[PDB]
Amino acid sequence: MKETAAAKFERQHMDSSTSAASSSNYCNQMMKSRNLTKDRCKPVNTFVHESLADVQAVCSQKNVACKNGQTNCYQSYSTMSITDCRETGSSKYPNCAYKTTQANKHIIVGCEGNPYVPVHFDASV
Numbered sequence: 001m002k003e004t005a006a007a008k009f010e011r012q013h014m015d016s017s018t019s020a021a022s023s024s025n026y027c028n029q030m031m032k033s034r035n036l037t038k039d040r041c042k043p044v045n046t047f048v049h050e051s052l053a054d055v056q057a058v059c060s061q062k063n064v065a066c067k068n069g070q071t072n073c074y075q076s077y078s079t080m081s082i083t084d085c086r087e088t089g090s091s092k093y094p095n096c097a098y099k100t101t102q103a104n105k106h107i108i109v110g111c112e113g114n115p116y117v118p119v120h121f122d123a124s125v
C-alpha cells in the first residue's frame with residue numbers, strides 16, 4: 001500500500017466521527033490508534049472535528065505565512081471544533097500520556113497537490 005501526504009494529514013489530524021473529544025481518555029486512545037507515538041512521544045497534536053470537505057476547503061481561504069516562513073499556509077475563516085492532545089508531566093515513552101483539551105479556533109494548514117488539500121497542521125489561532 002501507499003500513504004500520501006494528504007492521507008497522513010487525515011490520519012494525524014482529522015476526526016470527523018465526533019463533534020468534540022468523546023472522553024477524557026480520547027487523546028491517549030487516538031495518539032496510539034493513529035500511530036503517532038511509535039518511536040517517541042509527540043508533545044502536542046491537534047485533531048479537527050469537522051467534515052473532511054470543510055477542512056480541505058481551507059486551502060482556498062486565507063493565505064498566511066507558516067511559522068517556518070513558508071507561504072503555502074492557509075488559515076480558516078471558520079472557527080473549528082478541535083482537540084489538543086498534550087503530554088502530561090508524567091508522560092514517559094513508551095508509556096505516553098496526554099491531557100485532552102477541547103477548543104474552538106481557526107486552523108492554519110499547509111496545502112499541496114491536485115486536489116489542493118492539507119498536508120501539514122501548522123497552528124490553531
Ligand SMILES: O=c1ccn([C@@H]2O[C@H](CO)[C@@H](OP(=O)(O)O)[C@H]2O)c(=O)[nH]1
Pocket residue numbers: 012044045046120121122123124
Ligand atoms: O497546534 C499545533 C502545533 C503543532 N502540531 C504538530 O506538532 C508537530 C510539530 O510542530 C507537527 O507535527 P508534524 O511534524 O508531523 O507535521 C505539527 O503538525 C499540532 O498538531 N498542533
